[PDB]
Amino acid sequence: GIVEQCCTSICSLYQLENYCN
Amino acid sequence: GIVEQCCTSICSLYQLENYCN
Amino acid sequence: GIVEQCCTSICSLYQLENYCN
Amino acid sequence: GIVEQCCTSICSLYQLENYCN
Amino acid sequence: GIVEQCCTSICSLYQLENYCN
Amino acid sequence: GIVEQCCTSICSLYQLENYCN
Amino acid sequence: FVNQHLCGSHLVEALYLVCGERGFFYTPKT
Amino acid sequence: FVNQHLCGSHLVEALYLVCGERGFFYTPKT
Amino acid sequence: FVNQHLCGSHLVEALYLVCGERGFFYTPKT
Amino acid sequence: FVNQHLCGSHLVEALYLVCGERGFFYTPKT
Amino acid sequence: FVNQHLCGSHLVEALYLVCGERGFFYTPKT
Amino acid sequence: FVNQHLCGSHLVEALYLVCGERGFFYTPKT
Ligand SMILES: [Cl-]
Ligand SMILES: [Cl-]
Ligand SMILES: [Zn+2]
Ligand SMILES: [Zn+2]
Numbered sequence: 001g002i003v004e005q006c007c008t009s010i011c012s013l014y015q016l017e018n019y020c021n
Numbered sequence: 022g023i024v025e026q027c028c029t030s031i032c033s034l035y036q037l038e039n040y041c042n
Numbered sequence: 043g044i045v046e047q048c049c050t051s052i053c054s055l056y057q058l059e060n061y062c063n
Numbered sequence: 064g065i066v067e068q069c070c071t072s073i074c075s076l077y078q079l080e081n082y083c084n
Numbered sequence: 085g086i087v088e089q090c091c092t093s094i095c096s097l098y099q100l101e102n103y104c105n
Numbered sequence: 106g107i108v109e110q111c112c113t114s115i116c117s118l119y120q121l122e123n124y125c126n
Numbered sequence: 127f128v129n130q131h132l133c134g135s136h137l138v139e140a141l142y143l144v145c146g147e148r149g150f151f152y153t154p155k156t
Numbered sequence: 157f158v159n160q161h162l163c164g165s166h167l168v169e170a171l172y173l174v175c176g177e178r179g180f181f182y183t184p185k186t
Numbered sequence: 187f188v189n190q191h192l193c194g195s196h197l198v199e200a201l202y203l204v205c206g207e208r209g210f211f212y213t214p215k216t
Numbered sequence: 217f218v219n220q221h222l223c224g225s226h227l228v229e230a231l232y233l234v235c236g237e238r239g240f241f242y243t244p245k246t
Numbered sequence: 247f248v249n250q251h252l253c254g255s256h257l258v259e260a261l262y263l264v265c266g267e268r269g270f271f272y273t274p275k276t
Numbered sequence: 277f278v279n280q281h282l283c284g285s286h287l288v289e290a291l292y293l294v295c296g297e298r299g300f301f302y303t304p305k306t
Binding site: 064065066067069070072073074075076077079080082083084 | 217219220221222223224227230231234235236238239240241242243244245
Binding site for chain 11: 298
């Protein structure tokens with residue numbers, strides 16, 4: 001998931017935004 | 022400057038990009 | 043909420059665990 | 064010691080607590 | 085202490101070294 | 106450059122100081 | 127352990143610390 | 157914005173900056 | 187995304203976040 | 217609480233949160 | 247270098263920075 | 277002062293502490 005993706009590859013702020021409440 | 026824009030006042034992530042090279 | 047409990051007021055690490063999933 | 068243990072393996076908050084003054 | 089020297093007042097990085105072991 | 110050097114080897118605060126404005 | 131003010135990013139860093147793999151929610155509106 | 161390589165608490169910082177008052181949920185695997 | 191106060195080291199951490207490889211300048215005197 | 221994997225300054229952050237007003241000592245090898 | 251306010255976790259992060267392998271004590275009660 | 281091993285945002289923190297009011301520029305390769 002996002003936690004792994006950002007750490008083992010890369011992620012965008014836009015992907016991160018999906019996790020805001 | 023950035024401190025006035027983002028600290029004293031509030032800024033968006035897009036305004037922060039103003040300070041990218 | 044957490045901000046009131048832990049920022050405005052003070053909280054313990056055990057109270058922080060209140061916010062774990 | 065604790066600095067190495069936390070970084071090369073894992074450590075608990077409880078182990079960390081031992082280093083408070 | 086350090087909090088008075090560096091937080092309440094201001095300190096240099098050299099004053100911070102005062103607190104190294 | 107300094108960003109890579111600090112991360113892939115080591116760097117000193119003195120080297121870092123060169124990047125202040 | 128201790129009770130302190132934990133605000134902003136420090137609050138969510140503490141949540142990370144405390145919760146870790148459990149994960150957590152940070153919901154300032156409450 | 158640029159792509160991010162964020163591990164551990166750095167991801168939680170990033171979530172914090174991205175989400176602001178909305179807050180966020182931090183959900184690792186396992 | 188959001189607008190918030192970003193001060194001090196948090197400001198430059200946010201710049202890092204936003205700018206990344208582009209790099210950035212932090213020039214408080216302006 | 218969950219187990220921690222803390223390197224560099226992250227360990228010092230963790231010590232800071234764990235110890236509060238008591239403070240702490242940070243003693244790496246060598 | 248500079249003189250600034252260094253408080254809380256930022257203070258102990260700066261100590262980490264300055265001291266590193268020497269290690270340090272953070273003793274707010276003094 | 278001791279030598280530093282600083283990656284990612286930790287370098288930006290270090291620059292922040294070293295440069296204070298002067299601020300700094302953060303210029304990665306590529
Ligand atoms: Cl702060
Ligand atoms: Cl890291
Ligand atoms: Zn802070
Ligand atoms: Zn880190």
